Structure 1
C-alpha cells in the first residue's frame, strides 16, 4: 500500500484512457455515471465472455462501447444476436442509440485482466495457487511477454494468517514511464474470504 498505480501514472504518456468523451461541467458527472453503469452491467453480464477492457466513446449524443475480449464468439453469440441483446439494454441505461463493437485480443495470455480472471476463477474452484500463480508466469514467458509479476494475497488455503506471494520473471520496471506495463487486479471470493490477485505484464519500451 505504497506504490503508485502503474496504469494511472502513465495515462498521457503510454496508455490510452478508457473513455474518450468531452463533456462540459454541467453534464460531466451524469455523463460519467451512466458511463459507470454500463461498465458494471457489462462486467456482470459478460463474465463468461472473457472480457479484457471496454472503451466508451460519446460522438454527438450517442455512445460506442468497444468490447475488448478474448472469445468474441461467445460475445456475438448465434448470428450476432447477442450484440443487439446487449445494445438494447445499453441504450436503455445510456443516451440512446448505441454502436457497440468488439476488438478481440488474439494473445489472451498477455492481457493482465484475463490472467487475473484466470487465477481468480481457478482459486474459486480451489486449485493450488502455486500451480495457478506459477502457470500464469510460464504461459506468458513462453508466449512472448518481456516481463510479468503475479502477486496473490490473503488467506490462500484457509490459513489463519494472511500472506502474499509473488512470482516475477524477467523485467517489470515500474518506474520507467515509457515502459509499457499492463497492470490489472481481480478478486477471488473464496469460502475463506477474499483473495486479491494483481498482475503486472511488461511488454515494451515505446
Structure 2
C-alpha cells in the first residue's frame, strides 16, 4: 500500500536532514520559502549533470549550498562562467551571501535519485522498459550494491491498463535501519501521460 519514505523514517542516524539550519519560530516560513525556491530554479538549470542531494546551511548570511551533482565537469563551465551566472541569480533572489560548491558523489550507480533519473529518462526517450531497466538493476548490483529494486508505475505503451512493472536483485530490508537504503523517484513523463519511476538501493549493516 504505502511503504512510507524510508527517508521519512531514516531521520534517526541513517538520514541526516537535507537542509541543516536552525530557525526562529516566526521566521521559519519565509526561510524555507526562499530555500525551496533555491532548490527549485536550481532544479530547472543545474539538472544537466544529475542533481541528487542539495545540502543546505544557514547561520546568518551563511547561505552554504553543497550541490551534490553527478559530474560537475561540463557544468562548472570553462573558467567558471556558468557557476558564475548561477551564483549570480542565487544572489539576485537571496538577500544574503551565496555559495555554490559542486560536491558530486564519486560513483554514478549509487544514490537512487540519479539512478531513477537515467531510468525514467530512458523511457522519456521511448526506450525499452524491461530490457534497459533490468540492465539498470543489473548495473547497480554490477557496481557493488547489496540490493536494487526499481518499481515503474504508469501507462507503458498507452494501453489503458497502467501496470506496475517491477524488477529486483539483492536484499532490500526496508524495515531495518542500520542497513541503510537510498531512495529516489524520477517523475517520468510520457508524451502521453505521467508514469512514476522509483528506486531503492541497499548498502549494508554495521554503519
TM-score (norm 1): 0.96
Is 1:172 equivalent to 2:143 in the alignment? no
Aligned length: 206
Alpha-carbon shift at residue 34 of structure 1 (Å): 0.5
TM-score (norm 2): 0.95
For 1:120-159, what aligned pairs fall within 5 Å after superposition?
A: 120-159=120-159
Q: Which runs of 4+ in 1 moved over 4 A?
A: none
Alpha-carbon shift at residue 3 of structure 1 (Å): 1.5
Alpha-carbon shift at residue 95 of structure 1 (Å): 3.1
Specify every segment of 5 or more residues in structure 1 that has no aligned partner in the other structure, as ranges.
none
Is 1:94 equivalent to 2:133 in the alignment? no
Alpha-carbon shift at residue 131 of structure 1 (Å): 1.7
Matched residue SS, 2:83: helix
Specify every segment of 5 or more residues in structure 2 that has no aligned partner in the other structure, as ranges.
none
1: CA distance, partners of 2:25 / 2:159: 49
Partner of 1:73: 73
Question: Does the 8 A contact of 1:62 with 1:95 survive in 2?
Answer: no
Alpha-carbon shift at residue 155 of structure 1 (Å): 0.6
- RMSD (Å), alpha carbons: 1.2
Is 1:183 equivalent to 2:183 in the alignment? yes
Matched residue SS, 1:117: helix
